[PDB]
């Protein structure tokens, strides 16, 4: 509530429950190879 940012980019999609925990940068391995990769220096929130 007390930080400022240049811009906020929101990305939305749908996956199964088994893949929800895979959005973590380390856990991205299976998803990242073909579908969706989150940067190692990611700064933000993941909401599902």
């Amino acid at each position: 509530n007390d930080l400022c940012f240049t811009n906020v980019y929101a990305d939305s999609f749908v996956i199964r429950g088994d893949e929800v925990r895979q959005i973590a940068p380390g856990q991205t391995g299976k998803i990242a190879d073909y579908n969706y990769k989150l940067p190692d220096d990611f700064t933000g929130c993941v909401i599902a």
Binding site: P25, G26, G29, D40
Partner: protein, 48 residues
């Protein structure tokens, strides 16, 4: 020397833990080698 890492060979680190986590082992090895170089340079300064 190992400096508490899964291996002491640099390339083995790059082919056994994947970029998301091998950075930690790389960092540990980096700190160990840098400390050793520090000790060598300080000994050299005193001897000089």
């Amino acid at each position: 020397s190992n400096f508490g890492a899964i291996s002491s060979v640099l390339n083995d680190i790059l082919s056994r833990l994947d970029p998301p986590e091998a950075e930690v082992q790389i960092d540990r090895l980096i700190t160990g080698r840098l400390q050793s170089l520090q000790t060598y340079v300080t000994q050299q300064l005193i001897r000089a």
